Design a protein around this ligand. Sequence first.
Ligand SMILES: COc1ccc(CC(=O)O)c(NC(=O)c2ccc(Cc3c[nH]c4nc(N)[nH]c(=O)c34)cc2)c1
Length: 180
Amino acid sequence: TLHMNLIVAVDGCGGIGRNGGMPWFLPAEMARFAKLTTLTTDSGKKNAVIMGRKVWESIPPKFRPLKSRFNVVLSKKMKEESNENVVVARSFESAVSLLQDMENIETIWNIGGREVYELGLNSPFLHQMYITRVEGDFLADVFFPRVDYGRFIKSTESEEMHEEKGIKYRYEIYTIKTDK
Ligand SMILES: COc1ccc(CC(=O)O)c(NC(=O)c2ccc(Cc3c[nH]c4nc(N)[nH]c(=O)c34)cc2)c1
C-alpha cells in the first residue's frame, strides 16, 4: 500500500504562486508542512516528495534537497543531480514507478507545481489532499488545478482559524472516496 498525498496552501482564488515564489511567508504553516512530509510510522523508512522544477528552484539552495525526505524533481531540462537524496525524473510515470520500486519509501508527498498536482489528481495512488486555505487574494499567477471535491470526503475534525503576520488560514483534509 503506497499513498500519494497532495499538500498545498491556496488563497481565496485558488492561487499558489507569484513570480516564481510563494505569495506569503507563514513559518508555522511551513513547520507543519515539514512535519507532515517528513514523519513516518515505520522508523528507518522515509517519505518521498515529488515536485516540479520551479518548486525546486524556489527552495533556497541551503535547504535543498529537503532534509530527511527523498526528493524527486520532474524536469525535461534539468541536468542530473549527483546528490543521492534527489533524482531528476523525466515523466510522472517514471517518477512514480521509481518510487514504488523503493521499499523504504512509506508515503509520496506531492508538493506541487500545478502540473504536478494535476497528475497527482489522476494517479491511482491518490489518497489524501492536505489543503491550507489562506484568506484573501494574493494576486497569484499560478493556481491549484480545478478539482472536483465531490470525489472526496472532507474530514470533520475541528479546525480553528490560524493567523501569522496578519494572514489568516485554515486547514482542510480530504480523502478520496474510493479509500473511504
Ligand atoms: C530542508 O529543511 C527545510 C528548512 C527550512 C524550510 C523553510 C523555508 O525554506 O523557508 C523548509 N521548508 C521549505 O523549504 C519549503 C518547501 C516547499 C514550500 C512550498 C509548498 C509546497 N506545498 C506546500 N504546502 C503547504 N501547505 N505549504 C507550503 O508552503 C507548500 C515551502 C517551503 C525545509
